[PDB]
Design a protein around this nucleic acid. Structure first.
Ligand SMILES: [Mg+2]
Ligand SMILES: [Mg+2]
Ligand SMILES: [Mg+2]
Ligand SMILES: [Mg+2]
Ligand SMILES: [Mg+2]
Ligand SMILES: [Mg+2]
Ligand SMILES: [Mg+2]
Ligand SMILES: [Mg+2]
Lengths: 129, 208, 23, 71, 129, 82, 83, 98, 218
RNA sequence: GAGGUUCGAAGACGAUCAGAUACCGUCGUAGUUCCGACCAUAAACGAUGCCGACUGGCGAUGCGGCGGCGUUAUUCCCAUGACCCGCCGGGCAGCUUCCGGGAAACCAAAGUCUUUGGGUUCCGGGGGGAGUAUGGUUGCAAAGCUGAAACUUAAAGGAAUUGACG
């Protein structure tokens, strides 16, 4: 009403956190004068006003990670998730669910593979105008 | 590409294609793709000819390989199913990736952070990531695509006919391209299979 | 309007028929 | 469209004939009126007697008196 | 209705080569068609055409190449008196350096160059260039 | 463009689409020229040379290009008999 | 698109073309050499019949005519294959 | 400047087609033209539903519905906010979206 | 001094590409006016066509902003047209030259009929047309000079057409698309598909492809 | 000539308004209703002449045909018939696109046009004066059809742009 934040704050705030995630915390008056160290914020109002999102983005972070955000742990976290994999993603054990026509495609190929083929039901088609 | 002998279709390969369902097309059919289909079943699902599907796949290989400097091949995905994929062929070949937003004239603009005058696109869906194709009209950009049956072929050098719908299938193609592009020239025997699995290539939904 | 001047003249000419026909 | 045929030299001539009584610049020249109407009977100049001197008031945007002669 | 069977055909073989069509068939066929297409064959303006013999009229199937910019037809066959042949080939062809007014004289159907070597006039048909 | 003295005038000879034989613009920016590699014949491996291969804008914006790539490629022995 | 070998059109894609539109105009009709149960006699019925085809014998009636092909009566065979 | 390709009208393939006088201004309009709401309003409404369901001699009871085919001339359609007045791109989008 | 950001830019300043015919050949977008400044140093004399003041209307008076057209050419093959609108005349002009410079093309010139000497006119009768207006360029035997209105004469004289009779109509007053129609006239000389061409292209590498070693710079 | 259901020019009052011989009200004649003659015009409008050729998609639907893969039913099947899935001809239509058009709006056609002519019909040549005067003709008449000039006149107009006022 009185206070929604300006983009000098929203941008600087988000950019401190991108660069000092470890330095900050979920208090005000601590990270309040962290900002005095790591930046040259001229006015006390702004200096103080900036630790605004510095908190409102930690309260967000613990609950969840931002869809677009700057972070070191998250990037590190993402790499770990990517490495994990099934030994074969597409192996699908033995026996694929294959249409008779699909079997026909193989025959033109002339390849021979294991597989039972089932076709069933009326040709209903898709959708109900 | 038309693998007259050695770089033929094989059997271990085919089972992947069936397993992921890369041949199971969409219900509908953009005519440019009636070269690359054999039947529709009942229900109304079209069936891609894994033979043509591959020939084409090599055709893109021949063309990427052609590129002397491998890091001037843009590799796009805007839909998420490729997001992971593209990064991973890009890392395998040493090509250059764009996942998420095809950002404003990275092809046009001598001022934006990103421009790039890449010498070949590769794209997951022409349907979705359909700027870069169109910006590829203003630079002399050939263009590989991972088309479906339902996909327009405005501005494509070459269409690889696939599913490009279920993440599972997408990855495979981003594999096989990656695979062939390193088999051709690079650093694989032909005789032996990879260190690299598919599992690396086709995205994960929020799972753990 | 158009309709109400085509209807002006088709009243006015009818007065010149009447005026003329006297002589 | 146009008639275009090969024994159509008349339908053409006679077409391009009447579709000149819809030209303006010829219906001055070839009709009659002009010679009949212009005091200058088709003649470049003409002589006449000054019967009085009359000032004419110019058309609104330019105010002034023009100083002419009734001939 | 079908008045002039050239205009018919030539529209449809200009009007493919714009689209870059590889080859086209021409529905009505005729002698005059063949005889004027074989002229186009010599200066390169098309490739080999292969006339079907539906028992009635004829169909043709024209191998096109890229090379034909336009072919058209002068519809009434005016009688060209050899002195006019220039005045025509001025205002009906893009230059004096190529372009062919096919016409039909005493000694067969042929381009304007060949009527000039034999020194004959006759009736204009069309032009390709 | 020769003249009397076989003299090749004209400051360049343009490229020319492979698919339509239609001359490709000075400022036709939706042009292509796809380079496609061949192999050794036996193992695999791009070693050797090159199937260069051009296409105009119009054919691209029509939607064809890939129809018209294949047909050329399989004439040139790269692709074969699907 | 840009390459349809019109002169050598595959057999399927003439049968999905209106009779006169084909590469060569041929019909889409036929005669059938018809049995019927009583008599052994075979009549030479033309599919697209127009009239009612009566038996060379007498009593039975072979083909009610309809819009397109003729309606064969109840239990009687036919033979395309020729020409 | 043909505004609506269609002409706000929905004729095509005909000629004079039944006119119908509106349910408000009493103003005459074609059948293909004209906005055509069809209200299935409950009789009792939202409030009284439970007054009447108490006082009912009968048990449960579904209650009926009025099936009115409203049927406005465009004047009253716009004045009384049935349709509105859209952008050039929007004029086309003929779907009916709740 | 340069800082060529475009690769095509980089290749130009290190005596890498020899003649812009090597660019046009592959249909590459020039996007740095200085390129054409390498490659046609001197020559390339630049004539303003018109300074027409457009002006858009607003709550308080009218925004008035100028539109400069400039023609560019070297009386020898290459010509261009640049149209830049700006708040000020000198900005417009200066920054229209920058576009004209960019959008220069080569004009193919041919021959009256007798095939002798050097090329004095247009090969075919090309046409070019910009919104109503249209201009036809007819071939021309030597000595005839240019036979047109002022404006197409000032673009054709620049192209190094020596002779041409034209035929133009529409709203020829509207200078912009007097000049822009007869831009696309002289663009479409090199798009004219004649027997003289007609030989399958030998084909050549590409600047990006030959010199791909120097772009990944050493 | 028959008839008078409503509505309803004209027409009568009540209001509204500075006024309303208007709208908004209340009456109600001709007519709207029928049968018999005339009249011969619309924004009679897709503001797109008719025939004929050619050039892209993609969906739908009316009719007919053809083919198939369905089943609800319908019976032992059938024939059907009703749905489904295709193809084919010709119908009414839709969307979509840098064909190509198009001043523009837009247009599978307004596409094939300085790369000018498939056949043919009509018809416009700045705006008014004027669809007037006059002449002829048809009509019982309203009017219909044919249809000028002197004079005056510099723009009138069309498509899209910002404005700005509803
Ligand atoms: Mg008296
Ligand atoms: Mg009507
Ligand atoms: Mg009466
Ligand atoms: Mg009243
Ligand atoms: Mg009328
Ligand atoms: Mg028109
Ligand atoms: Mg014309
Ligand atoms: Mg006039």
């Amino acid at each position: 009403m009185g206070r929604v934040r300006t983009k000098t704050v929203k941008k600087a705030a988000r950019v401190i956190i991108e660069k000092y995630y470890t330095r900050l915390g979920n208090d005000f008056h601590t990270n309040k004068r962290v900002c005095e160290e790591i930046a040259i914020i001229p006015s006390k109002k702004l200096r103080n006003k900036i630790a605004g999102y510095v908190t409102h983005l930690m309260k967000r972070i613990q609950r969840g990670p931002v869809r677009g955000i700057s972070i070191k742990l998250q990037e590190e976290e993402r790499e770990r998730r990517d490495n994990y994999v099934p030994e074969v993603s597409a192996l699908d054990q033995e026996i694929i669910e294959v249409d008779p026509d699909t079997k026909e495609m193989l025959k033109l190929l002339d390849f021979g593979s294991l597989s039972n083929l089932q076709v069933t039901q009326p040709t209903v088609g898709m959708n109900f105008k | 590409s038309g693998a007259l002998d050695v770089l033929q279709m094989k059997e271990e390969d085919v089972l992947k294609f069936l397993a992921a369902g890369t041949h199971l097309g969409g219900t509908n059919l953009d005519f440019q793709m009636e070269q690359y289909i054999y039947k529709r079943k009942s229900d109304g699902i079209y069936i891609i000819n894994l033979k043509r599907t591959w020939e084409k796949l090599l055709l893109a290989a021949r063309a990427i390989v052609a590129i002397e400097n491998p890091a001037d091949v843009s590799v796009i995905s805007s839909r998420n199913t490729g997001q992971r994929a593209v990064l991973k062929f890009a890392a395998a070949t040493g090509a250059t990736p764009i996942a998420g937003r095809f950002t404003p004239g990275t092809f046009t603009n001598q001022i934006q952070a990103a421009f790039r005058e890449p010498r070949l696109l590769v794209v997951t869906d022409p349907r979705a990531d359909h700027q870069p194709l169109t910006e590829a009209s203003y630079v002399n950009l050939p263009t590989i695509a991972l088309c479906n049956t339902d996909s327009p072929l405005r501005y494509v050098d070459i269409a690889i006919p696939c599913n490009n719908k279920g993440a599972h299938s997408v990855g495979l193609m981003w594999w096989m391209l990656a695979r062939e592009v390193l088999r051709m020239r690079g650093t694989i025997s032909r005789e032996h299979p990879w260190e690299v699995m598919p599992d690396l290539y086709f995205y994960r939904d929020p799972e753990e | 309007r158009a309709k109400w001047r085509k209807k002006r003249m088709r009243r006015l000419k009818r007065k010149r028929r009447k005026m003329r026909q006297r002589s | 469209g146009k008639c275009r045929g090969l024994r159509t030299a008349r339908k053409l001539r006679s077409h391009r004939r009447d579709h000149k009584w819809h030209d303006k610049q010829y219906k001055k020249a070839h009709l009659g009126t002009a010679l009949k109407a212009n005091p200058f009977g088709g003649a470049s100049h003409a002589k006449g007697i000054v019967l009085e001197k009359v000032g004419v008031e110019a058309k609104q945007p330019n105010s002034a008196i023009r100083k002419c002669v009734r001939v | 209705v079908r008045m002039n069977v050239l205009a018919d055909a030539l529209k449809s073989i200009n009007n493919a080569e714009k689209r870059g069509k590889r080859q086209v068939l021409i529905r009505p066929c005729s002698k005059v068609i063949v005889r004027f297409l074989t002229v186009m064959m010599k200066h390169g303006y098309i490739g080999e055409f292969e006339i079907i013999d539906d028992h009635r009229a004829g169909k043709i199937v024209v191998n096109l190449t890229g090379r034909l910019n336009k072919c058209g037809v002068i519809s009434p066959r005016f009688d060209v008196q050899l002195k006019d042949l220039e005045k025509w080939q001025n205002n009906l062809l893009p230059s004096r350096q190529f372009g062919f007014i096919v016409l039909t004289t005493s000694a067969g159907i042929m381009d304007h160059e060949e009527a000039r070597r034999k020194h004959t006039g006759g009736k204009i048909l069309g032009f390709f260039f | 463009m020769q003249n009397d003295a076989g003299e090749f005038v004209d400051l360049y000879v343009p490229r020319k689409c492979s698919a339509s034989n239609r001359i490709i613009g000075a400022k036709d920016h939706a042009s292509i020229q796809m380079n496609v590699a061949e192999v050794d014949k036996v193992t695999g491996r791009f070693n050797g040379q090159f199937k260069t291969y051009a296409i105009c804008g119009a054919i691209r914006r029509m939607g064809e290009s890939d129809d018209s790539i294949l047909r050329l490629a399989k004439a040139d022995g790269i692709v074969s008999k699907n | 698109p840009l390459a349809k070998d019109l002169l050598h059109p595959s057999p399927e894609e003439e049968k999905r073309k209106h009779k006169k539109k084909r590469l060569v105009q041929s019909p889409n009709s036929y005669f059938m050499d018809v049995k019927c149960p009583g008599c052994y006699k075979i009549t030479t019925v033309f599919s697209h019949a127009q009239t009612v085809v009566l038996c060379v014998g007498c009593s039975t009636v072979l083909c009610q005519p309809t819009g397109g092909k003729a309606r064969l009566t109840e239990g009687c065979s036919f033979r395309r294959k020729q020409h | 400047t043909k505004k609506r390709r269609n002409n706000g009208r929905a004729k095509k393939g005909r000629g004079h087609v039944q006119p119908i006088r509106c349910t408000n201004c009493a103003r005459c309009v074609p059948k293909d033209k004209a906005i055509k709401k069809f209200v299935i309003r409950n009789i009792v409404e939202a409030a009284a539903v439970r007054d009447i369901s108490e006082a009912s001699v009968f048990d449960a009871y579904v209650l009926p519905k009025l099936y009115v085919k409203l049927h406005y001339c465009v004047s009253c359609a716009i004045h009384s906010k049935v349709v509105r007045n859209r952008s050039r791109e929007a004029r086309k989008d003929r779907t009916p979206p709740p | 001094e340069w800082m060529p950001v475009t690769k095509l830019g980089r290749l130009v300043k290190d005596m890498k590409i020899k003649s812009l015919e090597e660019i046009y050949l592959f249909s590459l977008p020039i996007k740095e006016s200085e390129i054409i400044d390498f490659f046609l140093g001197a020559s390339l004399k630049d004539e303003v066509l018109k300074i027409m003041p457009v002006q858009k209307q607003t709550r308080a008076g009218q925004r008035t902003r100028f539109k400069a057209f400039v023609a560019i050419g070297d009386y020898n093959g290459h010509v261009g047209l640049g149209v830049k609108c700006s708040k000020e005349v000198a900005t417009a002009i200066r920054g229209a030259i920058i576009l004209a410079k960019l959008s220069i093309v080569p004009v193919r010139r041919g021959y009256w009929g007798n095939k002798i000497g050097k090329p004095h006119t247009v090969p075919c009768k090309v046409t070019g047309r910009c919104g109503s207006v249209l201009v036809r360029l007819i071939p021309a035997p030597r000595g005839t000079g240019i036979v047109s209105a002022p404006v197409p004469k000032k673009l054709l004289m620049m192209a190094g057409i020596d002779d041409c009779y034209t035929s133009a109509r529409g709203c020829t007053a509207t200078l912009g698309n007097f000049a822009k129609a007869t831009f696309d006239a002289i663009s479409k000389t090199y798009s004219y598909l004649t027997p003289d061409l007609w030989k399958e292209t030998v084909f050549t590498k590409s600047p990006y492809q030959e010199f791909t070693d120097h772009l990944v710079k050493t």
